[PDB]
Design a protein around this motif. Structure first.
Motif, PDB file in Angstrom:
ATOM      1  N   UNK A   1      -1.995   5.952   0.178  1.00 59.04           N
ATOM      2  CA  UNK A   1      -1.785   4.795  -0.017  1.00 59.04           C
ATOM      3  C   UNK A   1      -2.562   3.882  -0.786  1.00 59.04           C
ATOM      4  N   UNK A   2      -2.080   2.987  -1.764  1.00 58.10           N
ATOM      5  CA  UNK A   2      -3.076   2.206  -2.545  1.00 58.10           C
ATOM      6  C   UNK A   2      -3.762   1.175  -1.814  1.00 58.10           C
ATOM      7  N   UNK A   3      -4.903   1.099  -2.168  1.00 61.12           N
ATOM      8  CA  UNK A   3      -5.907  -0.124  -1.694  1.00 61.12           C
ATOM      9  C   UNK A   3      -6.968  -0.527  -2.537  1.00 61.12           C
TER      10      UNK A   3
ATOM     11  N   UNK B   1      -9.014  -4.166 -17.226  1.00 62.92           N
ATOM     12  CA  UNK B   1      -8.985  -3.123 -16.210  1.00 62.92           C
ATOM     13  C   UNK B   1      -8.722  -3.254 -14.774  1.00 62.92           C
ATOM     14  N   UNK B   2      -7.625  -2.560 -14.375  1.00 65.98           N
ATOM     15  CA  UNK B   2      -7.245  -2.471 -12.985  1.00 65.98           C
ATOM     16  C   UNK B   2      -8.088  -1.409 -12.320  1.00 65.98           C
ATOM     17  N   UNK B   3      -8.798  -1.565 -11.253  1.00 64.25           N
ATOM     18  CA  UNK B   3      -9.350  -0.548 -10.420  1.00 64.25           C
ATOM     19  C   UNK B   3      -8.585  -0.607  -9.087  1.00 64.25           C
ATOM     20  N   UNK B   4      -8.229   0.655  -8.674  1.00 62.73           N
ATOM     21  CA  UNK B   4      -7.493   0.686  -7.349  1.00 62.73           C
ATOM     22  C   UNK B   4      -7.956   2.216  -6.528  1.00 62.73           C
ATOM     23  N   UNK B   5      -7.879   2.037  -5.398  1.00 63.02           N
ATOM     24  CA  UNK B   5      -8.210   3.058  -4.232  1.00 63.02           C
ATOM     25  C   UNK B   5      -7.015   3.742  -4.126  1.00 63.02           C
ATOM     26  N   UNK B   6      -7.000   5.101  -3.467  1.00 62.40           N
ATOM     27  CA  UNK B   6      -5.677   5.751  -2.861  1.00 62.40           C
ATOM     28  C   UNK B   6      -6.600   6.481  -1.803  1.00 62.40           C
ATOM     29  N   UNK B   7      -5.897   6.663  -0.527  1.00 64.18           N
ATOM     30  CA  UNK B   7      -6.275   7.467   0.422  1.00 64.18           C
ATOM     31  C   UNK B   7      -5.092   8.297   1.243  1.00 64.18           C
ATOM     32  N   UNK B   8      -5.008   9.441   1.293  1.00 58.38           N
ATOM     33  CA  UNK B   8      -5.926  10.335   0.571  1.00 58.38           C
ATOM     34  C   UNK B   8      -5.470  10.447  -0.836  1.00 58.38           C
TER      35      UNK B   8
ATOM     36  N   UNK C   1       0.621  -1.341   0.129  1.00 56.47           N
ATOM     37  CA  UNK C   1       0.103  -0.091  -0.013  1.00 56.47           C
ATOM     38  C   UNK C   1       0.598   1.251   0.171  1.00 56.47           C
ATOM     39  N   UNK C   2       1.977   1.233   0.906  1.00 56.39           N
ATOM     40  CA  UNK C   2       2.734   2.573   0.960  1.00 56.39           C
ATOM     41  C   UNK C   2       3.486   2.918  -0.316  1.00 56.39           C
TER      42      UNK C   2
ATOM     43  N   UNK D   1     -10.277  10.208   0.061  1.00 57.07           N
ATOM     44  CA  UNK D   1     -10.257   9.155  -0.637  1.00 57.07           C
ATOM     45  C   UNK D   1     -10.712   8.985  -1.948  1.00 57.07           C
ATOM     46  N   UNK D   2     -10.494   8.050  -3.020  1.00 53.47           N
ATOM     47  CA  UNK D   2     -10.961   8.017  -4.254  1.00 53.47           C
ATOM     48  C   UNK D   2     -10.456   6.925  -4.896  1.00 53.47           C
ATOM     49  N   UNK D   3     -10.994   6.701  -6.225  1.00 54.86           N
ATOM     50  CA  UNK D   3     -10.911   5.417  -7.015  1.00 54.86           C
ATOM     51  C   UNK D   3     -10.537   5.727  -8.509  1.00 54.86           C
ATOM     52  N   UNK D   4      -9.235   5.256  -8.825  1.00 52.81           N
ATOM     53  CA  UNK D   4      -8.810   5.415 -10.169  1.00 52.81           C
ATOM     54  C   UNK D   4      -8.865   3.998 -10.983  1.00 52.81           C
TER      55      UNK D   4
END
Ligand SMILES: *[C@@H]1O[C@H](CO)[C@@H](O[C@H]2O[C@H](CO)[C@@H](O)[C@H](O)[C@H]2NC(C)=O)[C@H](O)[C@H]1NC(C)=O
Ligand SMILES: *[C@@H]1O[C@H](CO)[C@@H](O)[C@H](O)[C@H]1NC(C)=O
Ligand SMILES: *[C@@H]1O[C@H](CO)[C@@H](O)[C@H](O)[C@H]1NC(C)=O
Ligand SMILES: *[C@@H]1O[C@H](CO)[C@@H](O)[C@H](O)[C@H]1NC(C)=O
Length: 517
Positions: free
Chosen positions: A220-222, A240-247, A189-190, A256-259
């Motif tokens: 951080x990637x989540x 397609x890869x979906x992945x979140x990050x925060x912040x 994640x880091x 937080x949001x989703x790319x």
């Protein structure tokens, strides 16, 4: 259970009581959509993390079920929490967990260890360690048995990242048809990097590749995911890869949001398309341009044209402090997933995936068309708290903005604006005066997403309003914006607003939506 509380979404999943975060273990099996979720069985904020469970036949009418993975030591000293993950139907019993009944369902999740300890497997773990573990169910997901004999099945991050043992999480496992292998995607994640492993049995894992960092890296990637989607109307597909990050969420948001990333996957390596990654470390493909769409996870068990993601409709910046009781947090509208070529670019397009015909009135409560809508605001109508708005209008309009003011008090000093900025070609959602905005200084904001008009010059918006939420689907669904709001009991008024000039070729319809509870 009576779900009639202020702010309780009537067509969004939430637990009857207590705190919920990330969707987990999304699996369609024998006609049932499973929805597991990060859950606190003992409180209204993050803690005692367990997998809660709900089911539906239609992604719409949810039935809450018993806790699936209850934090180990709950009610006493907690020694293992069940962080996010995924689930599959091991129909050929490659895991060997099947007996003489049903073949097993297998969940793969991050074990979080609050204390250093020796596990039943004989492995020793450190305080705050995150490792990947599995559990199985022989009763279609009602009850689960953790694989104590060998958990965790992926104890450590890959070399040379052993130091990342506290931030190594969120396994998304799936059966890869083409290579006849189980594939799992995890997040270091880091480091903003994903690690991909394969297995023949869900127990023994081999590292095969790593992906990233690319694009957004401001958090951080989540919650990584990997899915094959159809492109346009032919036989073309892309992964397609979906992945979140925060912040480090989308522009205009704090938190937080989703790319996402569009590319190809050969069973071991995901190769991003040349046009999906951008020089630098900020510009990204956003799955949602609003503040409240995070930890978006994909369903296993669905076919090419039927893929669905579910997102957590909250934001880590202020999520702990939203004014809800006795629950906290809801999921967003389930999102049908596909790709369309828009402006010569393969683009994620989402559709709102619920059984709308089962809960929507067929006659609109409001329906008007205007060749030319005058500058100003129209007469007020009453919508209630749960409804859908369809808007279409000309991109060539002379107004600076066209919008609907909704969930508004009678004098519109309380309102949420959802509209389009003609010069900027952007959807906007203004929740600055949306109701209770007292709990976080960043909540009272205006959000934006890009939306180029269609080939005919028409801009289309579909807007879903529930007790504490607004979701905008722009165009064919290429741009979505998801935002919570906390309006007062009287905030059930709406009108149209054409600011700075007239708006051409306006079509507006509002349909009431009934409760799913
Ligand atoms: C984890 O769950 C425990 C319950 O097992 C919570 O502990 C307390 O919950 C109440 C406070 O809302 C108290 O009235 C209880 O007496 C107390 N229960 C026990 C057995 O300790 C705890 O708050 C939860 N953690 C979080 C962060 O929510
Ligand atoms: C089960 O076995 C059949 C036949 O080998 C195969 O088509 C399928 O991919 C296997 N796995 C799953 C998860 O269905
Ligand atoms: C606005 O609508 C209300 C309720 O239908 C109606 O009574 C009123 O006359 C309208 N006002 C104007 C100026 O059109
Ligand atoms: C708007 O109406 C609310 C009550 O719904 C009232 O408290 C407020 O004073 C009004 N605002 C103005 C400017 O009239």
């Amino acid at each position: 259970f009576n779900y009639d509380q202020p702010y309780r979404g009537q067509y969004h999943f939430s637990p009857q009581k207590n705190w919920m975060n990330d969707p987990n273990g999304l699996l369609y099996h024998n006609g049932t959509y499973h929805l597991f979720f990060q859950y606190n069985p003992g409180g209204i904020e993050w803690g005692n993390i367990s997998w809660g469970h709900a089911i539906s036949e239609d992604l719409t009418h949810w039935e809450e079920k018993p806790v699936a993975l209850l934090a180990r030591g709950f009610g006493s000293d907690v020694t293992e929490m069940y962080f996010s993950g995924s689930a599959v139907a091991d129909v050929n019993n490659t895991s060997g967990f099947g007996k003489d009944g049903k073949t097993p369902l297998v969940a793969m999740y991050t074990s979080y260890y609050p204390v250093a300890q020796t596990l039943p497997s004989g492995q020793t773990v450190q305080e705050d360690q995150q490792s990947q573990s599995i559990a199985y169910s022989l009763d279609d997901g009602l009850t689960w048995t953790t694989y104590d004999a060998a958990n965790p099945v992926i104890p450590n991050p890959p070399s040379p990242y052993e130091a990342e043992y506290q931030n190594f999480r969120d396994p998304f496992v799936f059966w890869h048809d083409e290579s006849q292998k189980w594939v799992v995607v995890t997040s270091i994640a880091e480091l903003h990097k994903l690690a991909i492993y394969t297995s023949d049995n869900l127990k023994d894992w081999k590292l095969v590749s790593e992906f990233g960092p690319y694009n957004a890296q401001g958090g951080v990637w989540e919650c990584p995911g990997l899915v094959k989607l159809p492109l346009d109307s032919g036989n073309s597909t892309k992964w397609v890869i979906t992945s979140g990050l925060n912040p480090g969420g989308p522009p205009g948001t704090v938190g937080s949001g989703t790319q996402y990333f569009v590319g190809e996957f050969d069973g071991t390596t995901f190769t991003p398309d040349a046009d999906t990654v951008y020089p630098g470390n900020s510009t990204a493909n956003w799955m949602d341009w609003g503040p409240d769409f995070y930890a978006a996870a994909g369903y296993n068990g669905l076919s090419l044209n039927d893929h669905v993601h579910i997102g957590w409709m909250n934001n880590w910046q202020y999520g702990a402090n939203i004014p809800t009781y006795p629950w906290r947090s809801a999921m967003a509208i389930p999102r049908h997933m596909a790709l369309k070529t828009i402006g010569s670019k393969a683009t994620l397009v989402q559709q709102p995936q619920e059984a709308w015909s089962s809960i929507s009135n067929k006659r609109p409560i409001y329906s008007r068309t205007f060749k030319t809508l005058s500058e100003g605001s129209t007469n007020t109508t009453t919508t209630g708290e749960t409804f859908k708005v369809d808007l279409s209008f000309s991109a060539k309009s002379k107004a600076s903005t066209f919008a609907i003011a909704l969930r508004a008090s009678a004098n519109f000093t309380e309102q949420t604006l959802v509209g389009y900025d003609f010069a900027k070609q952007q959807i906007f959602l203004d929740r600055t005066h949306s109701g209770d905005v007292s709990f976080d200084e960043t909540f009272a904001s205006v959000y934006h997403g890009p939306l180029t008009p269609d080939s005919t010059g028409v801009v289309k918006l579909s807007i879903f309003v529930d007790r504490s939420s607004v979701e905008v689907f722009g165009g064919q669904g290429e741009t979505t914006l998801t935002a919570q709001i906390f309006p007062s009991s009287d905030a059930v008024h709406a009108r149209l607003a054409s600011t700075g000039g007239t708006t051409e070729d306006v079509r507006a319809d509002i349909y009431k939506i009934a409760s799913t509870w």
